[PDB]
From a paper:
However, we could not detect any density attributable to the NTD. We, therefore, performed focused 3D classification on each CCT subunit. This analysis resolved an extended helical density that can be attributed to helix 3 (H3) of the NTD of PhLP2A adopting two different orientations associated with either the apical domain of CCT3 or CCT4. Notably, only the apical domains of CCT3 and CCT4 were predicted to form a dimeric complex with H3 of PhLP2A with good prediction scores, in agreement with our cryoEM density maps. The NTD of PhLP2A can adopt two different orientations, whereby H3 of the NTD contacts the apical regions of either CCT3 or CCT4. While the NTD is mostly negatively charged, H3 has a unique positively charged patch (residue 75–78), which displays a high degree of complementary to the negatively charged apical domains of CCT3 and CCT4 (Fig. 2a(i, ii), b). Mapping these crosslinks onto a predicted model of full-length PhLP2A suggests the NTD bends to place H1/H2 in the proximity of TXD. In good agreement with our PhLP2A-TRiC, we detected many intermolecular crosslinks between PhLP2A H3 and CCT3-CCT4 as well as between the PhLP2A TXD and CTD domains to the equatorial domains of CCT3 and CCT6 respectively (Fig. 1g(i, ii)). In the open state, the PhLP2A NTD adopts an H3 extended conformation to apical domains either CCT3 or 4.
ATP-dependent chaperonin TRiC/CCT partners with cochaperones prefoldin (PFD) and phosducin-like proteins (PhLPs) to facilitate folding of essential eukaryotic proteins. TRiC-mediated protein folding depends on an ATP-driven conformational cycle, which regulates the opening and closing of a built-in lid over the central chamber of each ring.
Author numbering:
A (entry chain Q): 63 to 232
B (entry chain C): 20 to 519
Write the structure that this text describes.
Amino acid sequence: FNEEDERAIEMYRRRRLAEWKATKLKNKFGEVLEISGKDYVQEVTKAGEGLWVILHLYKQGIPLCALINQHLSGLARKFPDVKFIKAISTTCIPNYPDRNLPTIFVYLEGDIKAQFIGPLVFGGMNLTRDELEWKLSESGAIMTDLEENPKKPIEDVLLSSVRRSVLMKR
Amino acid sequence: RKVQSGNINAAKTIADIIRTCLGPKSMMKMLLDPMGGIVMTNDGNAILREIQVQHPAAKSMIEISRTQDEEVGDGTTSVIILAGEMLSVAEHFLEQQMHPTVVISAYRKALDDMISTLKKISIPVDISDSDMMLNIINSSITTKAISRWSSLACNIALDAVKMVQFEENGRKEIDIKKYARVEKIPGGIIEDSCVLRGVMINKDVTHPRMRRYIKNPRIVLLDSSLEYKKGESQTDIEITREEDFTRILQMEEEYIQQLCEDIIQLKPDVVITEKGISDLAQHYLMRANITAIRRVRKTDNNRIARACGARIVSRPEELREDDVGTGAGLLEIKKIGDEYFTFITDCKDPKACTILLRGASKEILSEVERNLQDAMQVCRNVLLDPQLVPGGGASEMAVAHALTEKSKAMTGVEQWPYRAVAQALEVIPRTLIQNCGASTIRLLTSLRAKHTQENCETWGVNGETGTLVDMKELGIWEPLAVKLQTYKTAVETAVLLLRI
Ligand SMILES: Nc1ncnc2c1ncn2[C@@H]1O[C@H](COP(=O)(O)OP(=O)(O)O)[C@@H](O)[C@H]1O
């Protein structure tokens, strides 16, 4: 009949008119970008509110900032709606100790989040990409999959046995 | 020359990282984090996955273990120990006389004849009766675990691994990783656990007014998204021309209704999608009597399309006849959990499956899951090769004795490496005796004498007593594929390491 179909068509008209206020071509990025000068914060911060950035500070000498670049570029190709930056130890923080070299973290507009510091958080010589998506996706930007890093939860025999004994017959 | 003598050290030290974890009685090791934490681990896999090394040979020889464990799922450290023992104290003389190629040539025919000797001895077993398979499985899961409804777990494991079977494509082939899923839900007695002939999904229908309880469904499986906009192709093309917007929204209706009619030209009682569904598509479907389920994962479609009852080729668009017609049972929606559960059950010859079990707490459920996972692995390994070989080190001693007899029979020019391998292959009984806690020399001499006079068809060693007893009354047996794979893998890893 003529009532329900016309009503459906008119909610499509209303919704499509409401969708005429959509985004403003925010998909310019999608590839890896590099900066190396005095371009510290006037570029990363000065952008739209609905962005998703990731910075990186390294030294280019130690063979742990060379493995992470391949993973970061691979994530860059897959996800187009993100911002990725690189720098060499001197854009900000003029003096920086070598104790915690690979520094990767996510700005938000006015409040930084998810600070990753030091080589111990990554492990070392064992960063498969999947752990990198997991760690980055623990706070937003999730694509699929879960529980793909059993290498961190090693089982302790004695404590687990005591817990099982005290819980099973409780 | 010094390259081999340098690379052998890393191999032997990694082999010596874990050596006493074999057998029933085993020790435990401790790792110390840089901050100060302490973890006391027993698995060989956890240790040989945590420590990182430098020399490339050590990295490759660690990776071999995990690569092999990915497929067979039974033996990991035995090949490492055997390769290390063979490498350590066999080839260094032969390098001192500078003849590597002769050593490799001897290795090839040694592998060939030991494989032939292992194939010579075997005992067949029937596969019709399941009681003796249950007994064998129970003997196999005698490994350290908790005996809580073990017989039930073994029975369910046997039933599932027999039901998945093969589809007569490239001869027998059994897969367990992709066509078996475990689901655990709290509440109710533990006896109700059983195997389900169909498949379960955690989602529900998209609109309250569609029918749920159906009899004899006709399922269609379909990918991609029903909705179609393609806005990004044409955006802000003469923004002042809203007539363009009106025309495009008018013409999209023709495409949507054409797709709907093409689908509705058949009788697809149920429609399963993955991306999403719009309002016109669901409205048109609801005009007729169809049910839709939205946004299911890829693996669930893999199970359903795997002849779970709904034999479907999963075609994206413009399907044909006889690719939708399927023989299934009952489709139901339940409220056992907080979320509705879909049941597609009582089908015929379902190649897929879904195993569920019930318990009060979650940790006991995790333990039971681990137990039945191990049982399923063993039962899958058994069915591929229906022949068995005695274990406990008797096979190794028999092979070594036959090799020694052959070496003294033909007495070839390169017999020294042959004998070196022959009496270097016997490291496992020494380790078992050392772990037991008795004298190695006297027991080894007694075993050699028994193999010389009685031929030790089934006589071996006991890991809990330390006395030479016959295994016919003991009941210790192992399959045939694992031993061959281990011996081979050791041979080619040794050859590859020596080739550098
Ligand atoms: N009751 C027993 N008596 C003597 N030897 C045993 C007994 N049970 C197991 N073994 C031997 O101990 C070995 C231990 O195997 P396992 O723990 O799986 O290590 P791997 O994964 O390296 O095979 C097996 O190869 C088996 O031959």
